[PDB]
Design an enzyme around this catalytic site. Structure first.
Site, mmCIF file in Angstrom:
data_model
loop_
_atom_site.group_PDB
_atom_site.id
_atom_site.type_symbol
_atom_site.label_atom_id
_atom_site.label_comp_id
_atom_site.label_asym_id
_atom_site.label_seq_id
_atom_site.Cartn_x
_atom_site.Cartn_y
_atom_site.Cartn_z
ATOM 1 N N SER B 173 1.002 -1.122 -0.002
ATOM 2 C CA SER B 173 -0.111 -0.169 0.130
ATOM 3 C C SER B 173 0.720 0.854 0.128
ATOM 4 O O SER B 173 0.177 2.141 -0.436
ATOM 5 C CB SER B 173 -0.933 -0.043 0.464
ATOM 6 O OG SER B 173 -1.484 -0.845 0.908
ATOM 7 N N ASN B 347 -6.521 -5.799 4.238
ATOM 8 C CA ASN B 347 -5.837 -6.683 3.838
ATOM 9 C C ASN B 347 -5.545 -6.154 2.436
ATOM 10 O O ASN B 347 -5.821 -6.710 2.070
ATOM 11 C CB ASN B 347 -5.853 -7.898 4.031
ATOM 12 C CG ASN B 347 -5.194 -9.091 4.736
ATOM 13 O OD1 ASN B 347 -4.081 -8.642 5.017
ATOM 14 N ND2 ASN B 347 -5.656 -9.433 5.618
ATOM 15 N N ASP B 348 -5.350 -4.469 2.258
ATOM 16 C CA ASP B 348 -5.927 -3.727 1.276
ATOM 17 C C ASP B 348 -4.412 -3.400 1.148
ATOM 18 O O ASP B 348 -3.585 -3.262 1.495
ATOM 19 C CB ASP B 348 -6.314 -1.992 2.350
ATOM 20 C CG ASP B 348 -6.705 -0.733 0.556
ATOM 21 O OD1 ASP B 348 -6.183 -1.666 -0.053
ATOM 22 O OD2 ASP B 348 -7.464 -0.085 1.206
ATOM 23 N N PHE B 349 -3.811 -4.226 0.063
ATOM 24 C CA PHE B 349 -2.917 -3.787 -0.770
ATOM 25 C C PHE B 349 -2.018 -2.407 -1.611
ATOM 26 O O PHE B 349 -1.667 -2.177 -2.179
ATOM 27 C CB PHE B 349 -2.553 -4.852 -2.249
ATOM 28 C CG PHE B 349 -2.705 -6.547 -0.969
ATOM 29 C CD1 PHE B 349 -0.850 -6.675 -1.392
ATOM 30 C CD2 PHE B 349 -3.606 -6.862 -0.459
ATOM 31 C CE1 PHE B 349 -0.880 -8.218 -0.511
ATOM 32 C CE2 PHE B 349 -2.921 -8.694 -0.643
ATOM 33 C CZ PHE B 349 -1.875 -8.808 0.071
ATOM 34 N N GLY B 350 -3.694 -1.377 -1.385
ATOM 35 C CA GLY B 350 -3.309 -0.719 -2.123
ATOM 36 C C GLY B 350 -4.331 0.053 -3.327
ATOM 37 O O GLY B 350 -4.685 1.202 -3.530
#
Ligand SMILES: O=C(O)CC[C@H](NC(=O)COc1cccc(C(=O)O)c1)C(=O)O
Ligand SMILES: O=C(O)CC[C@H](NC(=O)COc1cccc(C(=O)O)c1)C(=O)O
EC number: 2.3.1.-
Lengths: 431, 406
Positions: B173, B347-350
């Protein structure tokens, strides 16, 4: 449990040298809705930053400028009135609120009596379309929740249909996502619906809509709302069954609506001799002759009405109900629309309500409501607000494009029977 | 149906080799298959996902290691994890006809298409000598992306693997403390431990339980029970009773509820909440069918809670020490796995938080994978069931009041 942080007017932000004030003329379709309430919808998010959202709104309103205008009411010397929309940049009411005890679960899992807290997340409750002389034609409320944010809006049906409103929301979210000044998002020339009733004089002279009963939205109801989810597998199953029984080709959405209609009427308590209607929005842009461009802005939607008796609907099967819907859609022609507009001008009808014993379909499975990423992720839900009407069925495309969600407004006794309908709960997930 | 775009070995970004010794808990799982879980997204950029994984493996460097098998002079073998930076198998694939609706709504026979989204099917924990201890597959769908992973239970428990996923998505992120390993906490056991060489028509349904119905079951269980019962104990007990009701088992049969137990705070001395490695055991509550059906929800919930209270340091120690003199390296039970404690959606990868979390193969009757809901107060379960049980469950009016089955 909702506190208002701020109430302000958001004006269009005009990089260009402003032009003259455009006037938009209202057709019989627009005027016949003057007494109805604003339509209210909204989107649920994990995260929205309000400052960027408000700045991007001012830019988006420049691009969709009729939404920043006002109705103007003219007094005719024959003791009638006329209305047009003045694109005067008066601006949009924008409310920032906080509901810190409400969490995503609460809005995702709504179920039961309405109104409840969720009604307060919408900004235009009790506003009628003819109030657009003094209230904005679009109203926005951003409500910060415990662990998320809801963006609700209400709009005046005389300025836009749902097709146009969702195009505006998509532009606003794109601007917000990329850069709030709008400098990095393509600006596109707005094409207006214009005047497509060439045999009707305008502005149309009508009785003042405000000199009319004016009926309340806060009166106690016994209504409930439930969410219905139909999986891709079950949409397909209904589609195949409807087509197997039917003599013409039936679309997936027609089959699912027909199934819900039949089920809703089975459990309604209506007598067999009563008439029940399925009311469906019809985008008329491509049915008019000549057709209008697919992107022209304004309300170009007509309500189609399929009529049957309760006994007929229950006695026939799914395919027959779907054929009633499809036959009604096929009947919505250009010649029909124009002849009916000319009749409307000599028998003006501006009702206060639609009626509570129908299936009242609204919104559409066609609108990509999840494409509205404002910069922090696509929404996690799309919902409708007040007013509440028995038989309202708000259609949303699913997060899964092949699936469907419906927000249904029903009487408590009907819900009670629906939840025990074994077959219905095989095809439909009720929450 | 599934087309492989690319395969890469991802080592730690940064260029003696630390050894992690394996406890009886690790060694007992050597013949089990890798555990497989994953996250569904609207959008993931694969290049950035891969670069960030290398950075994340700097911190969680045991996930980039390999098992080493020693042959001991007494005709046994020993295993340890060599933190040699060999790297993580990372597969990029495309499933162009599969859409979000399909993964959200999986329902019916397994294995089906979804099994191929996971990288470690048929891989056993002892294969970690030659296969990576974490395996990642990113599958581009028609209108979304799935990140599937399999992991070797000898290197991590679910607590640790989800902390790794959290760290990876945080890196992608864009850590105040360094990674601390669990270490050797069996002071009465020598290492390396000598062991012998370790080498069905199922359906899956999603269950959702609303905040309102979680609270209703919690209140019911606590009204009936004599000790305090947590929300998840109440809901698990309700599902357990319902499954056994529809199992077809006779009253005298013994049935079990199996539950993962994070032992970090139960050991003496307690281990740090964030210490890395497998520090979990399976607790087993045993009852007869007749008792579970005769007594109410609160009694079943008390059976679960009583089993959890019994997972003590002293028992674990005694059992491990005897395990080394009785090595055991191996139904119709409720097999609870994963946990409500893991924050799926952070779990936000961006490009946005995940829209669902799911488990992959292998499929086993009675598996009940617990996921905390998008709505934090709610619960999701991924249940593996026999068709006859499903048919009975869908006709159970009360069950379908409390639980939304799709
Ligand atoms: O846009 C449409 O769906 C119909 C517009 C119009 N009707 C009203 O403006 C008031 O009646 C309704 C009907 C459906 C939904 C709602 C609502 O508030 O969602 C209100 C009409 O029937 O031509
Ligand atoms: O983490 C856990 O839930 C149990 C870990 C381990 N169990 C196995 O390694 C094989 O049995 C299972 C049990 C639960 C789920 C699965 C699966 O494949 O999801 C497999 C044990 O008992 O300590």
């Amino acid at each position: 449990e909702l506190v208002v942080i701020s109430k302000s007017i958001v004006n269009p932000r005009s990089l260009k040298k402003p032009t003259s004030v455009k006037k938009i003329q209202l057709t019989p379709w627009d005027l016949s809705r003057l007494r109805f309430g604003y339509l209210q919808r909204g989107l649920l998010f994990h995260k929205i930053e309000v400052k960027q959202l408000q700045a991007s709104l001012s830019v988006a309103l420049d691009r969709f400028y009729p939404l920043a205008g006002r109705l103007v009411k003219l007094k005719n010397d024959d003791d009638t009135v006329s209305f047009f929309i003045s694109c005067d940049g008066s601006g949009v009411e924008f409310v920032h609120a906080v509901a810190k005890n409400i969490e995503l679960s609460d809005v995702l899992e709504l179920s039961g009596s309405v109104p409840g807290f969720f009604a307060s997340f919408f900004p235009a409750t009790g506003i009628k379309n003819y109030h657009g002389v003094s209230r904005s034609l679009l109203m926005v409320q951003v409500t910060e929740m415990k662990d998320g944010v809801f963006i609700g809006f209400g709009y005046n049906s005389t300025v836009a249909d749902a097709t146009s409103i969702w195009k505006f929301i998509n532009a606003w979210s794109e601007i917000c996502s990329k850069d709030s000044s709008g400098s990095q998002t393509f600006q596109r020339r707005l094409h207006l619906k214009g005047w497509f009733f060439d045999e009707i004089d305008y502005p149309i002279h009508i009785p003042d809509p405000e000199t009319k009963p004016t009926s309340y939205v806060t009166t106690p109801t016994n209504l409930q709302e439930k969410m219905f989810h139909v999986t891709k597998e079950n949409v397909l199953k209904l589609d195949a069954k409807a087509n197997d029984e039917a003599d013409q080709k039936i679309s997936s959405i027609q089959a699912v609506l027909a199934y819900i209609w039949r089920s809703m009427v089975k459990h309604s308590g209506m007598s067999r001799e009563e008439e029940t209607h399925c009311r469906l929005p019809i985008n008329m842009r491509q049915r008019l002759n000549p057709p209008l461009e697919e992107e022209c802005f304004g309300n170009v939607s007509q309500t189609g009405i399929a009529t049957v008796t309760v006994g007929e609907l229950l006695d026939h099967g799914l395919g027959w109900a779907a054929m009633q819907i499809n036959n009604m859609e096929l009947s919505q022609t250009d010649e029909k629309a124009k002849a009916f507009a000319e009749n409307w001008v000599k028998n003006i009808k501006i009702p206060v309500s639609v009626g509570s014993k129908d299936l009242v379909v609204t919104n559409s499975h066609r609108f990509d409501v999840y494409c509205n990423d404002f910069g922090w992720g696509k929404p996690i839900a799309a919902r409708a607000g007040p007013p509440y009407l028995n038989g309202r069925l708000v259609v949303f495309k699913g997060i899964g494009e092949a699936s469907l969600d419906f927000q249904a407004c029903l009487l408590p006794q009907v819900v009670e029977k629906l939840v025990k309908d074994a077959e219905f709960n095989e095809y439909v997930s009720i929450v």
